[PDB]
Ligand binder design. Sequence first.
Ligand SMILES: Cc1cc(C)n2nc(N)cc2n1
Length: 829
Amino acid sequence: SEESQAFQRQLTALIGYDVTDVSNVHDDELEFTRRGLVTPRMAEVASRDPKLYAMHPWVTSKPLPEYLWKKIANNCIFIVIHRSTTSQTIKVSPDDTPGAILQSFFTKMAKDFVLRVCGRDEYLVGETPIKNFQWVRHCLKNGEEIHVVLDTPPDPALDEVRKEECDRKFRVKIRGIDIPVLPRNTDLTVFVEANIQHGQQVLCQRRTSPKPFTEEVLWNVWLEFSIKIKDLPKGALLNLQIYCLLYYVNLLLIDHRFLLRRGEYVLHMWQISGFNADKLTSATNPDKENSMSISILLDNHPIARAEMPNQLRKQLEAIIATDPLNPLTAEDKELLWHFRYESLKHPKAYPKLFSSVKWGQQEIVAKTYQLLARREVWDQSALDVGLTMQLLDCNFSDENVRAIAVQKLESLEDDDVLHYLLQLVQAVKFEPYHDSALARFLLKRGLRNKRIGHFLFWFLRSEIAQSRHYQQRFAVILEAYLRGCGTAMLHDFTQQVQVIEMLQKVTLDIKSLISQLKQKLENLQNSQLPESFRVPYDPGLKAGALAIEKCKVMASKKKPLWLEFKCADPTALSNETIGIIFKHGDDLRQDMLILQILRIMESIWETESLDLCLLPYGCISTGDKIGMIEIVKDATTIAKIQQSTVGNTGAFKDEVLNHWLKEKSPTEEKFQAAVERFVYSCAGYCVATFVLGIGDRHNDNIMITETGNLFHIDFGHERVPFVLTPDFLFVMGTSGKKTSPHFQKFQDICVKAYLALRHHTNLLIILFSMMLMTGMPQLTSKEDIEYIRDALTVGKNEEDAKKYFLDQIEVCRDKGWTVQFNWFLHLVL
Ligand SMILES: Cc1cc(C)n2nc(N)cc2n1
């Protein structure tokens, strides 16, 4: 059809990639995936509750934290209900459903409807106690009144979905390599290495002879491997590398139809910038003009009681008790395999056990599939996200192993899917095939919930915009989502994309070059910028017109744009603007990953009734070194606070921060609340930041709200474990080497928080490992990743762990202003 063609054009603009362009493909896997994702999409669309989909209530099944219960007076929650120019306050029980609150309202005022949060597209609806609504918890946490408007539920009609319509050994011939132009810092020798890989592990390796490195190098050589065709596992990669490591490319040996790869291939390779998720890609380099190519030929197809003694059991249990980074010896693997039926009784053993499998032996793989048919213990075990994420990393390439991990994820509630969404999207990179149980899981959860769907859009779009390695795969997943989200959502994304593309242009234009910014913005406000758009990092908020007068270019070397928008919602309780920073020059994908880990740390702390006052601000990467950042209101840099008393060239003063806090507090009651908030937030950031190895920061990269909330920024790319400078210590009523009630509180909070994180050691290790592999380029799959195991002091008891962190606090006190001064000393010399 022609409107079908028009609809595909609309999808192309939203995706930022054309899924129908078949220039960079050697098989129909992507097209097969597009067709394959139709069924799971249609099944999810057919399954959703129209009213609940339209209203997307944001709820949790978790208990109300102890720190939140203390904020409730006499089992009473006040809700302010608006109707027009008037309002009405109503007392409610924490266990009261919005349905019962609505009936309580009509009774109180006598002589169909829905409760919507004033100024937001957020609804307090469904069979849930009000204490379980995220907005209510947000209000309770932040000391804000719950303001609601009585309005008509959104028409589910707006979400209408458009109607759709061999015992021989394996061998490979390396013909040669070709590159148009040589200048590559040298003039050398080259050889080709061919690896058969499964789960990051090399099953077999062959190499060509070394030859002089010219624009064309030929071998015409058969490289015969020790592995039999019969023994090649599904998901095995033929990894081809050029050593001078300079270039790499992968080819799936068994395709998406279970057929062995045959014939001629000319593969355009990826160059090493000068392990990680990019090294695993089955995509070929789309740049056919300047990339190195490798020419190969394949010529080769259906797919083919006892009890442990005491001491061996103790040995096995000790292997299983070790962290995810502890290497498995040949003996350890053999024990795990030999007593696999005992290992299966321990869910925590699963990653180690499946790493003990000889994936290059058909009979062994067969035995593994037999083993997993008896999955009663795994199925009945409680969901452990950390343990599940370990099965979805680079170490596992078997579909059945990965699928049992995804099976476990099905039990996650929406609030929990949101917590892990970004790293689950990134984990798609470790899938051998485009169509996977993980990709289908993301698709389903996105289509089931608007909030998840909104973030799925942006997380996928971020990678499609700048990852040549994964854009094709991520584009097919995004298209599948967009074909089921409904027309209202399609319209919404269109507006957001239009706004971001225009603002990105202004960002780069101003970067090349205040008066000029304001002229460019009036021009946008004139004939381009749509009336309103959902804020990508906070979809409940709708931004209206730019407040031109409040817009500016930040006085930084990156010169980011500081933009302010009016809120488009008339029901908003304030005339306060929505602030967004647009910046080029930092890889904001790195900030996104750190910020998500901080949200996870907060949820861990919540389990132990701790509120560390982190501020994981909104951040979305929109393209190569470009994106948006949420502006936290009434916040300043620690360095700026120092500088306002006159920055003599790093002449730091101890009392300045406390002075600033006192100056910004309207009363002494508010000032004490600010000092309390600083103690908690300082503690939160010292712990979080130390664990992640990002603690040693310049003061210009730490901010504070007038309300005392400290927060670190700019995560994208002598020594100190974290920042606890003499100014921070003075706010805590401490100086030099003495102590105080606030500093004792700080130490107590840090220890409790650090110990709480250590209870989730394995989860933090997997999340850290995945973050490095997918977000921060070439990493030593050992050394770099091992930092977090050292930071989390694995193998220490709580008292030793407590002493360790208290000693880290002392290192900071010993160094004082020395490390902060070193940036200034360096920047001059
Ligand atoms: C990177 C960054 C993050 C936040 C939250 N803010 N807030 C302001 N006011 C500036 C800023 N920069």
